[PDB]
Write a protein that binds this ligand. Sequence first.
Ligand SMILES: Nc1ncnc2c1ncn2[C@@H]1O[C@H](COP(=O)(O)OP(=O)(O)OP(=O)(O)O)[C@@H](O)[C@H]1O
Ligand SMILES: [Mg+2]
Length: 223
Amino acid sequence: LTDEDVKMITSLSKDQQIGEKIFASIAPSIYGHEDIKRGLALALFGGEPKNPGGKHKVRGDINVLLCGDPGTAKSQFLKYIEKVSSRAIFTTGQGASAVGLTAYVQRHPVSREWTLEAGALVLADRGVCLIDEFDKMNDQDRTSIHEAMEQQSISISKAGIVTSLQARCTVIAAANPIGGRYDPSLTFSENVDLTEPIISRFDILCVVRDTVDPVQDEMLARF
DNA sequence: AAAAAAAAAAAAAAAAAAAAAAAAAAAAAAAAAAAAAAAAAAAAAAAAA
Ligand SMILES: Nc1ncnc2c1ncn2[C@@H]1O[C@H](COP(=O)(O)OP(=O)(O)OP(=O)(O)O)[C@@H](O)[C@H]1O
Ligand SMILES: [Mg+2]
């Protein structure tokens, strides 16, 4: 997991078409969706964090929100990102995940050991947190994601533990529209069942809009 | 009268069994507490004219 030949990387860097090769090289098992692929590649590379003085933090993380009507490979995109990214962890708005968004402290079920079970937002501090079914979160999960995605920290006050612990993750989320079908007559905000503060903390909003197109349908079916 | 004897007869030392005294003496199991987590019942706050 350590690189010895920077030389090949740099040779590819001079290819002058490395960008389109990179974009075409993500989620190879998903047909189409090139704009989502550009956005996911950008997020996967990320920007530059910066903090003038020590008082004006600006993240370099590119958070991406895929909102699209069902059966449009959103979860497959998140699984691809989990495969490629180092320090990627996967979580869901339902209860069907090993890690949960919110930190808690408890005795571990298999260890029997009193453990600060830091959430999925801080387990991905230097990496990416993948939240599937983003619109189906708790109120607790929602305030957790809001704190991590605004402050890039998680504040515990549970047992005797008063700590703040860092969650500098890129959040990539997939959500479904309200009613299970994206309505382009409405704005994105009134389609998704997420509050404005949550949506504003995303750089890229990919509307994965599903339409009947015989050529695209045929290519996808062949795939 | 003293001169050999020839015993008591005392001492030191030994034995010599008794019968009493002296000297040795952690690790294994249990329970209780305090803490957890879990099935059930119970008590809250969002729904609409
Ligand atoms: N463009 C595509 N290319 C390749 N496979 C696709 C594409 N679109 C859908 N699929 C396939 O359709 C199936 C459904 O995908 P997926 O579960 O990712 O959809 P989803 O957006 O998560 O749906 P939901 O919103 O219901 O969770 C997947 O197995 C995926 O392989
Ligand atoms: Mg899905």
